Amino acid sequence: DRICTGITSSNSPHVVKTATQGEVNVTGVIPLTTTPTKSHFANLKGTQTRGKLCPNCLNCTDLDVALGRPKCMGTIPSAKASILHEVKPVTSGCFPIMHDRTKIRQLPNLLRGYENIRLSARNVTNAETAPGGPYIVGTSGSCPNVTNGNGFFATMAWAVPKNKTATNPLTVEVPYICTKGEDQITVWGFHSDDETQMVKLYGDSKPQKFTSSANGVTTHYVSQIGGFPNQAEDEGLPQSGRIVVDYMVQKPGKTGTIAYQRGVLLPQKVWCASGRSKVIKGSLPLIGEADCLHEKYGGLNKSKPYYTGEHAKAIGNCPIWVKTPLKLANGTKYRPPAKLLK
């Protein structure tokens, strides 16, 4: 009489990978993979999320807040997780900017990159005593106040010169100004207007040249006088003219240098930013919470160790991407049922 050892025969629909035996069939498997689905973004659990540079300086753009617009000036906190919702952000009024002639659009997206950001603790450069004639810090309607009046970006001073005269390039030397080992983001620009209005506000009616230097990087601009572009991302008709605006990143302890002429929107309130926040491209009504933010799939919480789908940047406690669905053999290699015995 025989008493033997044997293994089972069973339903083995799952196929697994094996180096020695090639692809084998198996009783059961524990899948390690999943294809998540596109859902909305949420609050990264262990850290803190952003998307609006400011919550309590409500009804604005991110860019508006970046530029230092009158009402859009809220004391804004930290994160260590940030969502990038507008790849090319827009302004919501104030004085008409010719956005596309500089890198200025991305200024919020740059700021977003830091943990700690702050409007200012002063303003860098005396707008009145600035090189070139004594200036009257121009202000403009088209940029209301808390009380109404005329506004001009806390960011920059609208240096309109009394003693109206043409000027050979003047140099300001925008100093560091900040606390700690923060960075400084200086913002500035130049106003230009039509032939007639140019002579009115400044004693010159020809293209004005502007050159900046910071961390070895030089930029050079030449103003436009006539036929400005069909006003957009503005409010209401100082349409005679426009502003070209640019930013300047000053690393800790370093000095910037703006050579300028007429229409110079000198810098004033300068950002100081520090730390590194983890940034990702998302969509921003941030509903509830997830474990891990995926650029595509979005708010998504970890179930299995690996995931299948579209690879993309993701932050937080994420499953790791994998080329193919992966299964862990939880059973026995398929054996046919046996009567091949005697």
Partner: protein
């Protein structure tokens, strides 16, 4: 596997052991009995579980946006960052595929070791009167129907129930 093929085991599934994956058969006048050892299978199920825990420990840095690289001004950098992200994803994925492959091979190949273990558990409790073939099977001097076989799977057997010798602990 390659062991069972060479050392003439039966590549024979025994549909009928509804419970365990591995156990004992039993052959005679009664026909063929079948049993499943409930310790070989819970030991197999445990191994797999731990392997799952090992596979699920791997931590890999997050992989996010470049802080100072701007969406319209630094596109040639941003491209190289896409390339980096892709090559990372690819490399680790291929490593993960390898980890699991080795894992699988191991889990699969183990079965013939369970069988070889189960067989030694049997040799002991069948006593010295039995005859080991090499098959993973034993020629016994007594009959073994389902009740006898069930007592071998439980470890509650006595060669001596049927007056034969025994190994005493």
């Amino acid at each position: 596997g390659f062991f069972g093929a060479i050392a003439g085991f039966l590549e024979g599934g025994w549909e009928g052991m509804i419970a365990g994956w591995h156990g004992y058969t039993s052959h005679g006048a009664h026909g063929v009995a079948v049993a499943a050892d409930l310790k070989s299978t819970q030991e197999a199920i445990n191994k797999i579980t731990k392997n799952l825990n090992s596979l699920s420990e791997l931590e890999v840095k997050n992989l996010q946006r470049l802080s100072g690289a701007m969406d319209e001004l630094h596109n040639e950098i941003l491209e190289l960052d896409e390339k980096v992200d892709d090559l990372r994803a690819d490399t680790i994925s291929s490593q993960i595929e390898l980890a699991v492959l080795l894992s699988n091979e191991g889990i699969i190949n183990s079965e013939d070791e369970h069988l070889l273990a189960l067989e030694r558990k049997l040799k002991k409790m069948l006593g010295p009167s039995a005859v080991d073939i090499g098959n993973g099977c034993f020629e016994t001097k007594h009959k073994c129907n389902q009740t006898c076989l069930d007592r071998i799977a439980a470890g509650t057997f006595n060669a001596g129930e049927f007056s034969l010798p025994t190994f005493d602990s």
